[model samples]
Target: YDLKWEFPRENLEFGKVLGSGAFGKVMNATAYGISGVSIQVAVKMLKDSSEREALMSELKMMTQLGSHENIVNLLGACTLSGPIYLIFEYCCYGDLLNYLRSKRNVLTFEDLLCFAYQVAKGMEFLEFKSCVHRDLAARNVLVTHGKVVKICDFGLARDIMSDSNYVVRGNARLPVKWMAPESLFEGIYTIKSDVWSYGILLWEIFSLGVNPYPGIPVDANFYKLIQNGFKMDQPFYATEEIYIIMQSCWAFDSRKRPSFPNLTSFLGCQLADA
Candidate 1:
């Protein structure tokens, strides 16, 4: 489906549609006003009324997060039309997921550590803002050039401790293998659940684009996992430390997972080892 929707914006020049989720479609559009500045900004256009609230909620979470180098810069935002659009810095390196796919045959330990550290740093800043990144995954983390990683996409993110209430969380779209055990069965998710997702992202990175459990057959879902033994076979870059953290992250009890800050510190140490 051609999900790209047009807006009467003066700056954005039409480009190829990148991808679309249930909520909106993103495009690799170029913007005006800066020399040598053809940006690869992804404009997210919310086309559904029911999703508008969630889209705005996601943009709000991003606005609260200022310009941390690790987090993608929110250049501007607007909700004028029936559909709202979020303008963000262009990340030409695309996203971590695509990068992992391309590097599946040759991903190295250093490579995994680099992306892991950047993502942990981004998550650290989000947690610092007292905002929990409800969606933490390779797809949500974008890279610039070859080395810089920026966390993006907060449509599903929310403040875990907020007194403000909304529709109760749902379990419809949770990725079976990537989801925390509790989030899978109970629909309750928290910052720790984000961490759990982060751990899965880490696995995605280390596994060099290999699906977490390649042996599993096609059309598998979380319900199937609830009964079968769901475990990831060690990947090429799975070091002892990586193994431990990823294991702890899937803890049935959320309390046992390491904090984003702890992950930041630990990955920072690994980066230092370089």
Candidate 2:
């Protein structure tokens, strides 16, 4: 696959739209005459100016690297002047978040471990590439037929600098419940902050789509969580071992949270929701 080149000239028959996001919509497709070669590919259609550059940059960045089994592959990119589109290898199992919403109780320790390890592996590569994934969540975690999961969406991600929140700008309002304490309160972030966010993501996966804020009704939420020991009364029906891990992931002080290295290791110790 030529990640940095134009889309394949050979016609890729467009089937029904599989999913739609803030900007682009992915469709299922098959190469003409290749009956069993049909595959899902996420085609990111650029909406306007702000997104075009990001899409191009991400393509350039991803192409420069090799592939990882857990993360999706960038098959090719279309550089037609208007409405640029990126083609990526697809996962039909759907996102873990929405999948869990209907079957939270069936979550198992091994399943969570499988998903969490894939995330960790992705992060490991990102870190090795000197980048930090700032917006990871269940939404970004894509899985396969049974237990193969991978992380996607590097649009909001930034390559790491001396510190974590690359721009030195205070943390923007990320998903509130999933917001790390340091990013939420002090408005600063480092690698530690990313770990904190990952921890919260772990919790969300365990909670079966309950969301970070289950019952709170206020717009200002992280503060309330901080005031309440940064804890949730019931982290859904996850095992007590995994539940405690989620709490640790939400530690008020950033230093207290585990590093991705430690996190993947800790996940080795235990294991989910809706």
Candidate 3:
């Protein structure tokens, strides 16, 4: 079938790099031909043709998943040309991690709670779609010009409708600090595992993007510590209620953890009150 999101290469004007990793890079770009208006966008492309398969996989996943207000929107792509480009809505303010840290002095408690609530709403949509966002953290979430939060980085996301969990294979790097015990030890990932990461994200938001488990080193011992019931203390900015919600996401049994739907409602109420 012809791809509806495919765009012509001539419509894009590439700009500076936004970020890059081992196999690919994302850059800022000005895209034309969307109702004759020029729009800013972030373009993700492979650094080498050898990794084209990886970028294609990501493109397939994004196309299958559809759009959401709290999830970064996939604009279009220039996949038919020499260099493949995956277009995404430009989140001008950048990732939440640096945004939180830089704006710590100006952000209020209400602002922090709003960020948490926005992320929960986004995850709720993902869970409803039966998709597992294997990496859901502050660094992976992007902030827009209007201060809106959009969950980004679907590089590790997978559709889990056919299976309850996705099993990791081979030696692959993971974000251990934001991982759940089940994921860290068993190499199992589900929507519940994403919930576990959300708790860590909450800590990052309320703590102004500080690293989790402040005094502890992230080693084999740290995994053991989590397996033995260690949980991060409540961040200074989080209220008792907020901390309780964070703890709920860390339940030992993934079955006991709150679903994204439950979290959204709870956080919605919290934000309403705030």
Q: Give the Å shift of residue 52 in candidate 1.
A: 2.9
lDDT string, candidate 2, 36-72, tens digits: 4555565655436676677777778778766787677
Model 1 sits at a Cα RMSD from the real structure of 7.5
Against the true structure, what is each candidate's TM-score? 0.79, 0.78, 0.91
Put down candidate 1 lDDT per residue, 1-274, tens digits, no spaces: 1122232466778688766544457776777652265665777775445777777766676666578988888766556654577777788877778787876435567867988888888888877787766557777788787688998863423222331111233523435556666666676677888888887888888877666556654253634664353656566777887777777676667898889889988888877885
Q: Whose lDDT is higher: candidate 2's or candidate 3's?
A: 3
Whole-model lDDT values for every prediction: 0.69, 0.64, 0.83
Candidate 2's TM-score: 0.78
TM-score top scorer: 3
Q: Write the per-residue lDDT of candidate 3 for residues 46-133, one digit (tens) a residue.
A: 7555568778888888888889999998878877657778889999988899898888536788888888988999999998889998
User: Which residue pairs in candidate 2 collide?
Assistant: 100-274, 101-274, 104-273, 104-274, 208-274
Which parts of model 1 are misplaced by more than 4 Å?
A: 1-8, 34-38, 81-83, 105-108, 154-171, 217-231
RMSD to the true structure for each prediction, in A, is: 7.5, 6.3, 5.3
